Amino acid sequence: QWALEDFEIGRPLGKGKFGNVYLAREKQSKFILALKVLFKAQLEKAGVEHQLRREVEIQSHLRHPNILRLYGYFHDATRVYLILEYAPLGTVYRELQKLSKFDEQRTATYITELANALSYCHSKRVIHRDIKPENLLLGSAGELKIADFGWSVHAPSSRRTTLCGTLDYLPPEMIEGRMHDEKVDLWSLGVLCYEFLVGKPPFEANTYQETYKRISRVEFTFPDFVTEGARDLISRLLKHNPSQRPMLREVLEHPWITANSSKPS
Numbered sequence: 001q002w003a004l005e006d007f008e009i010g011r012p013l014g015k016g017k018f019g020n021v022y023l024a025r026e027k028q029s030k031f032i033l034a035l036k037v038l039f040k041a042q043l044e045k046a047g048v049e050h051q052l053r054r055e056v057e058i059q060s061h062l063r064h065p066n067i068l069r070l071y072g073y074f075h076d077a078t079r080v081y082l083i084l085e086y087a088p089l090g091t092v093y094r095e096l097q098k099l100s101k102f103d104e105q106r107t108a109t110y111i112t113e114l115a116n117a118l119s120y121c122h123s124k125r126v127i128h129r130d131i132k133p134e135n136l137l138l139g140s141a142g143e144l145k146i147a148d149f150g151w152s153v154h155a156p157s158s159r160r161t162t163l164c165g166t167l168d169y170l171p172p173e174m175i176e177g178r179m180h181d182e183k184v185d186l187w188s189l190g191v192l193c194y195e196f197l198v199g200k201p202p203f204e205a206n207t208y209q210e211t212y213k214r215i216s217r218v219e220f221t222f223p224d225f226v227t228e229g230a231r232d233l234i235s236r237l238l239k240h241n242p243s244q245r246p247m248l249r250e251v252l253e254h255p256w257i258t259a260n261s262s263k264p265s
């Protein structure tokens, strides 16, 4: 139903081994949006092909203000095209490299939007498993949207598929191939809260091996400027036992969150 013919392609929003994201405009309506264009070639010659199926099937059926919408898709036997809501203010990744760290009001707000978004996903038993600054996009009023559902599945789940990138955001159950569930995204949330305030993930190391160890041991420390309420929220989320991690309601209602945040639940 859609095809490339319907779009003008603008400036790239991301480039990589498998393809690119483009700013794009639909020709008949002038609707501006993003096109995530993957090379079939590389998805197959990599073993990611099934993930594109789940990314589309899951994201397309989610509707939430803090979830980046997927409007549709098409292909053309060289490439696949994901038709994405365009996020004008970029990534939290870029925001973080810009300001180095975030203040407590801004951190707590981003977390609230995250937990609201995950609340809705966990309602549909959908787990993201790839929550990280590169996949947090900023809407036109600066509000956070979760994007990139390549790693999302329905919970519970195992991991047959290979963990290719950094481990900084993944919980112990996931780096070890165990069965995992919604609590995966809660660990990630605490990683993010920490990174937002400190400027680097709480388990960053020089090697994948060292990083893996620090995650397995839950081995992180706070720089002295991190306050007691943040220390408390982070420590409660970064628990080895997934069952000990809170529910999202306890996060949205954490005192430090409600004090410093501006957005509601």
Ligand SMILES: *SCCNC(=O)CCNC(=O)[C@H](O)C(C)(C)COP(=O)(O)OP(=O)(O)OC[C@H]1O[C@@H](n2cnc3c(N)ncnc32)[C@H](O)[C@@H]1OP(=O)(O)O
Pocket (backbone or CB within 6 Å): 013, 014, 015, 016, 017, 018, 019, 020, 021, 034, 036, 037, 038, 068, 084, 085, 086, 087, 088, 090, 091, 093, 094, 134, 135, 137, 147, 148, 150, 163, 164, 165
């Ligand atoms: S883990 C093995 C290492 N290599 C890989 O597997 C990565 C290969 N991937 C590719 O080459 C693909 O071409 C890309 C698109 C890079 C796949 O990356 P993602 O699956 O992570 O796709 P994202 O949806 O996360 O897009 C990545 C960057 O592009 C920008 N972007 C995406 N969508 C939007 C929207 N709607 N609006 C604005 N920007 C958008 C983001 O900036 C995103 O993160 P960056 O900060 O640019 O890195």
Ligand SMILES: [Mg+2]
Pocket (backbone or CB within 6 Å): 026, 031, 071
């Ligand atoms: Mg459209």
Ligand SMILES: [Mg+2]
Pocket (backbone or CB within 6 Å): 134, 135, 148
């Ligand atoms: Mg990504």
Ligand SMILES: [Mg+2]
Pocket (backbone or CB within 6 Å): 148, 149, 150, 151
């Ligand atoms: Mg992906």
Ligand SMILES: [Mg+2]
Pocket (backbone or CB within 6 Å): 199, 200
């Ligand atoms: Mg860094």
